[PDB]
Fold this sequence. Notes:
Chains A, B, C: Keywords: Cytoplasm, Magnesium, Metal-binding, Nucleotidyltransferase, RNA-binding, Transferase. Chains A, B, C: It is an enzyme of class 2 (transferase). Chains A, B, C: Homotrimer. Chains A, B, C: It catalyses: RNA(n+1) + phosphate = RNA(n) + a ribonucleoside 5'-diphosphate. Three copies of one chain form a homotrimer. With about 600 residues, chain A is of the alpha+beta class. The first copy, chain A, has three domains: about 1-250, GHMP Kinase, N-terminal domain (Ribosomal Protein S5, domain 2); about 265-340, Arc Repressor Mutant, subunit A; about 360-570, GHMP Kinase, N-terminal domain (Ribosomal Protein S5, domain 2, 2-Layer Sandwich). Chain A is built from 13 helices and 21 strands. Chain A has helices at about 90-105, 130-145, 170-175, 205-210, 220-250, 265-280, 285-305, 310-335, 420-435, 460-475, 510-515, 540-565, 585; strands at about 5-10, 15-25, 35-40, 45-50, 65-70, 115-125, 155-160, 165-170, 180-190, 195-205, 350-355, 360-365, 370-380, 385, 395, 400-405, 445-455, 485-495, 500-505, 515-525, 530-535. In chain A, the strands form four sheets. An eight-stranded antiparallel sheet of chain A has the order 8-7-9-10-21-20-18-19, with helices on both faces. The first copy, chain A, starts with a strand and ends in a 15-residue tail after the last helix. The interface between A and B is large, with 42 and 45 residues.
Amino acid sequence: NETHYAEAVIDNGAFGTRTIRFETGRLARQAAGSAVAYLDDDTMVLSATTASKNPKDQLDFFPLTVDVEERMYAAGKIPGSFFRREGRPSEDAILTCRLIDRPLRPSFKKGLRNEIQVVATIMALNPDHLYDVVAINAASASTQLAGLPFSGPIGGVRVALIRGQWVAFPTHTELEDAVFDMVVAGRVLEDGDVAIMMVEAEATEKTIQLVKDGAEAPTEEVVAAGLDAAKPFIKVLCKAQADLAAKAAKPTGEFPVFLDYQDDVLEALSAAVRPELSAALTIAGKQDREAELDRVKALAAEKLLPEFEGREKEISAAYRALTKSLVRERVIAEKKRIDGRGVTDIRTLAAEVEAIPRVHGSALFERGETQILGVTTLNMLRMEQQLDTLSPVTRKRYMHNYNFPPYSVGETGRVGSPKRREIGHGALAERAIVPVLPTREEFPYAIRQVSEALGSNGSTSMGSVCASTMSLLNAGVPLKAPVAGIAMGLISQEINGETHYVALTDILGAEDAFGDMDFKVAGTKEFVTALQLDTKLDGIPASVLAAALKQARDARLHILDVMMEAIDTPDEMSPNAPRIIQIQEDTGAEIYIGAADGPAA
Amino acid sequence: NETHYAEAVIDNGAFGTRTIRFETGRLARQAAGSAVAYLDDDTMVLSATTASKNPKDQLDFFPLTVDVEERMYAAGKIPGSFFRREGRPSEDAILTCRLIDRPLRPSFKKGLRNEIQVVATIMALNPDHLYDVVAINAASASTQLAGLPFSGPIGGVRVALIRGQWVAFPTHTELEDAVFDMVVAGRVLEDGDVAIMMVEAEATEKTIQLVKDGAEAPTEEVVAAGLDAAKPFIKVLCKAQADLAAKAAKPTGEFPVFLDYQDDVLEALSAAVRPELSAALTIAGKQDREAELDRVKALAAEKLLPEFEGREKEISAAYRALTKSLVRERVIAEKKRIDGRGVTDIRTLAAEVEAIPRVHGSALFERGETQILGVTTLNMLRMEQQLDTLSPVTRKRYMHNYNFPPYSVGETGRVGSPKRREIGHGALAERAIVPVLPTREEFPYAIRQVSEALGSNGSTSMGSVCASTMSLLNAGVPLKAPVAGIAMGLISQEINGETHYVALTDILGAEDAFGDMDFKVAGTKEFVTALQLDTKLDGIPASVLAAALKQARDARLHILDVMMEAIDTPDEMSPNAPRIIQIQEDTGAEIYIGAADGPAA
Amino acid sequence: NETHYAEAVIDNGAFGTRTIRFETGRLARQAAGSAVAYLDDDTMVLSATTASKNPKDQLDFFPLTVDVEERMYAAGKIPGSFFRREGRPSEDAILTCRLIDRPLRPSFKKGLRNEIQVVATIMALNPDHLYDVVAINAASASTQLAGLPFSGPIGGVRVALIRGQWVAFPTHTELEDAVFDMVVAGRVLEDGDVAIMMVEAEATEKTIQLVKDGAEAPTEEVVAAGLDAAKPFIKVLCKAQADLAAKAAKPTGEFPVFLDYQDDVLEALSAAVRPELSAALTIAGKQDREAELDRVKALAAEKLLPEFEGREKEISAAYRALTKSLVRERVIAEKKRIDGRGVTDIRTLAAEVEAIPRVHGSALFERGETQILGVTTLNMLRMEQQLDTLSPVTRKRYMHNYNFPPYSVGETGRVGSPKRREIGHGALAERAIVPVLPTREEFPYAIRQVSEALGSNGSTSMGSVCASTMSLLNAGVPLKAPVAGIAMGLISQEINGETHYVALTDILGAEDAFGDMDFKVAGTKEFVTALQLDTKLDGIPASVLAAALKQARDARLHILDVMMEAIDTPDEMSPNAPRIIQIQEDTGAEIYIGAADGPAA
């Protein structure tokens, strides 16, 4: 029972040096794995990882749960809620859960069935520090120490482009000069290279002003440079964790790994319907191709029966594994996708404003089956949201809500509190717009943007950005520039010794599961305002990444054109919207005073 | 992929013409069925209906779920809640769900087992419009278009008696002159006649004053007239939907329908215990008759076994179907009910005030096994409820809460948030009292009425009205007149070519499932303050409806007599209640000022 | 259908006489059992007990649920919440549920499997009365009348040491002079003696001042005297209930009782592994002894198989029953515990302050596997909690929150709203500290204490007290005296005619299930500040109880020594903490005014 430590020195040159220190051995010793991460021995995050005694094979996927507990005492304050106790998690907590879950989930060895839970508690917080990227490393560390079969350690860092430099673990003070804020997580390969696994980035509310005053705008080139600048830090963080795990020398428990299907079933099924299935997947029409598929499912379920009694869960798994191979295979060879499109083809677009009566502003955006309705509401600043969390942010002038109803994909389901996904997609589309919003003084209004995903099948979040841009303009909000988004995919196949890469524009929901990389990009004509990436690939050639981003950029620019035909400049503010510039009875206006339906002079 | 429209022109003569316009084809195309309904192209409600891929036969009933999503942006305002996002549904939303569910649920072909969900979103709302009846039609339309086996279309309308005229889809401005507000939903029969399926009506806070100044009080006769005035509008709405569905020409999916039991089992069981069961149902005593029943259940479960192995779910279903027939049969032939009562007999009554110590006012009402405790609390107006929804109502001086605990019917269960039923019954009993309350100026108090259903078995909601009247009077609230309620039932059987009708006074819970029509009526000695009806019957003779309402009226008047013996005029306001008419320390009163335990001069 | 009554006269001599009156027959007649309890015909609590029709044998334990419904109308006020309706239960309600559940659950005949629910509603409350102990008796009464197999009636009373006298059912007015407040519940044995089953006691905020002015401090001796003074009242309450049940003469339903295992399996298993298991339990090392156990589980599961097919649930139950006997047996004979300790040995201790950076105050307390992190936060009084319940308490200057995460015991689980246990343990540790806190005027700060149970296995609540004392001192809070706690156990075995008693110091979680009595004690060096007890024993010798409490006292004093080495006197208040003693902009301080980071002169 001894305490072990390890440090990751982060050198930012003229901006100073900081340290992420890891600890294990004194806190939460009953958990399978436990670790603490400090940022300059000031901010502190405790992470505990536990696993169920027995595997939960009654499931088809890996059950991982991430929870982030924000403790108000970390900021030296008593919770302001009526119950004086912190309750339902803040937006930051939920977003941090996802930042942790995204790279962690895939890291676990395929087949694992034990239920895994990770709980990160923010116990001490220097008001000038950002805890999210500290929690990522703590979550990785505790999991590494739990003796769980996963490709750890995972290093998480934030790099922001401040005065031409990519500063690691920037502080709020430093972020005042950032043109781009980017969170990156990766692992170290056996050859020593760093493999990037997750990216969550955005431009800032300072970007346009900084660029105007001299800073370099964040384009695809700059963003890619930021990714390279992140690797050295990630390596240091992973090394520090590996050192911690080596010192702790915890035991590697016995965790069973299950197969989706034994080889016999895959060989049987293939031999039974490989040519038919291959032919069926050539049918572009969705409902027309789904006909054949439901049929070949019989021709197969017939031949392999009753030879395989009670091996259904295996024939299905194999049936998907097979479909996946054939489809990927066809994209590389024939260069055609499952819906008939070519690698750079965007589904049918459609844009229009004034989609809903009475509301301050609205827009309808369509891209294939993905349909997003955006609605804008403008009220006086006294309606802006008030926040009391472990964040310096206390008010929010621009609010975005993303709704994803079950009927969006033709099914039934709970209609209530927003899920973690809604929070995530909502946040990304929110961050994509923030950089082009007018200032509080230029436009004295609390702004609430709502995106209703009425139809879904391919990045509703990116579609949510486009609908937001138009809806806001339709409402009369003077945006500094319009913003559009697109969701890409990438296929990496090694065809006889050599590796082939293919970037797919505007991927369908299914193309996500078939691919090796998933990235989303939003921005104006000049630069990137939001970027999201996820992959397991050991890495891809600089030229491939550049080409994929350039392709994505081309798609974004086309979409901005379609959008501009619907609306170019802000519209005349709706009459229903208030006009902002005793007496509140005489003038009929509530006092910066306005509260006038429009008249009031 | 084209957009289709259809219109229902509502002609209100001197009050103007308005239009409910239906649309389908551009919004939410992934749902089984989708439709939009506009009221004067201003107020807008989107409705989407979805169904589960596979039936859910593991259930005994039809699983339908209705959700009403109120979007604050429809009123051009940012949600006022701390989270600036709309959350748990308002009372109006829940009540609208029920207005939709009541006529829709029965409309589905018996046997359907797929899970069905309907989601209506209020997207645009003219502050002078009422969205509930617009949502009803939208819900019907989307469902009709989903290709689901149901007796659509269902037309929903509101008719209010304004200046001698029944105005369809009245506005808040017009409702200022209404003596009766009535929501009605129905369908069009093959012969072209309209069959009314649901009614939700009430008198208003203006009724007594209007009648005093000349208007005609809403009696059984007037109410029946209102129902007739509703039919023409319902027909126009159904026609508009049928026209929409015809234009859309969506496909009629393959939805399986299941039988509760095959005929063999019903014929077997009947032949096995028909005479015994028939005899057992003649025993008036509940616990004494339930003895025989549990026995004949054996004599039968014996003979039909093991001849029917694994056919239990069928023997039970058949056993109920059989009981139902025998019981109905006996009511018509012998004119006697399952508990020994005659068609017009009211169960044993009991009324008393001062049932609970200390509280401002209380009353205990008993009618058979139904027992309701009512408790009144009086506070200063600053305690009245504040509301921020899609309704013009911002404050509520009179609040009614209805609690239905599991032990109310001898069972265990969740004790927490109020269910949709509690909201519904609570609302109906609330609306029944509102018309006789003193004005804000006559009685400057926030009033909270709570009804505890301590015993249940036959309209606790109607019993809730009676307890409210007495409790309020016991507290010293000067009601303009006392209110009482009664729950009726109706049996319609075609005995050899001709159809027989029998109205049942104060029905038991079981008599609800045995009947063909269920209606509840509340009111003073002079008129109706609340009415609720549900049926599937193609329609009943004018004279039958009139007779049923007259019977119900007789019952209501008898109950008012029993109530008046307990309390006639308001009592002396309790000393514990406050008296309303720096200095708040000197006078000991908080300032219209009172805040005095009674003294303060 | 008649109403029955019975009274329990409580004679407090010079302090007056009060009465608890029971009633049954008029309210909630559909519940299996129903009863009302009045305190001086003023305060009123209705209790209804219901049971599921069919037993729920798919469970291993008895499913009992207690709910306490606080009705604001009982105090003559409209709920202050936004929804003007009472919602999620107050702390008092949850604590009252536990006061009821603790003695009631064990009272049910072993083997019962029907789901039982008890709902107590507070309908009328004299502001000077405490309803908790009234609800206890009402819950007992309704359950007794339900004809359920349980050792009723259970009498609940509160005795407070006021001016040298133990006053029964004290009022808030009288509690102003109490040095000790103690809730006790018990039953009457056939010989007429009272058997105490549950105790929940605490010193008060008045204790130290009263003692200084002459009153006798509450030591082990005084506390024991209070227990004796409680028995006469308990007897009167039980007699009153028995009289009520006799008058009601309700029927005793047919409730099946199930066996955990038939005798054959226990005799088989014993003969198969009794000597091995007995040997295995001699291994002190946890992981080393769990090796043998998992093995003998085979040697047994082997011999008894396949002789016992489908009798697993029985072999397991028997395996525990056997382990329990052997372990208890060894403690009495050899005087050694399952972890190798002796009856008076305390596990390894460890204490330290300044455990977390930045926070106002913190401390880490360890006792065996039980590890508690305590964190203190100090804010201005405007941050104190505001309360609006059926209690005279409207503000809370000292707040304690107890968190028990799943990883605390190495497992996964829900991380959200606090469970009833957290509320209970949180409350007990809160009450243990309240008596030594500085006054509002001496220390003008709102204080929030949080205990994180990072490791658990033996009274985290008592460990929570110790961490609170140190954490508060570390923050600079001038406590009048330090407080420590310890959890005891007691084993009662009749070895050949005579009964042997053995008190165990600092019991492990398992030692709780093996014992016959569980008690926790906290306090300073001078007296007891909190006491908690639970047992089913018919009673224990005065000398045994005294000896157990003296042993517990010795343990508490040792722990206070270890704590004092870590911190003795309060520390210098943290700089991050605020200092309390237009202009709020000039002085930078918010106005008793302070709001200064420290400077402000």
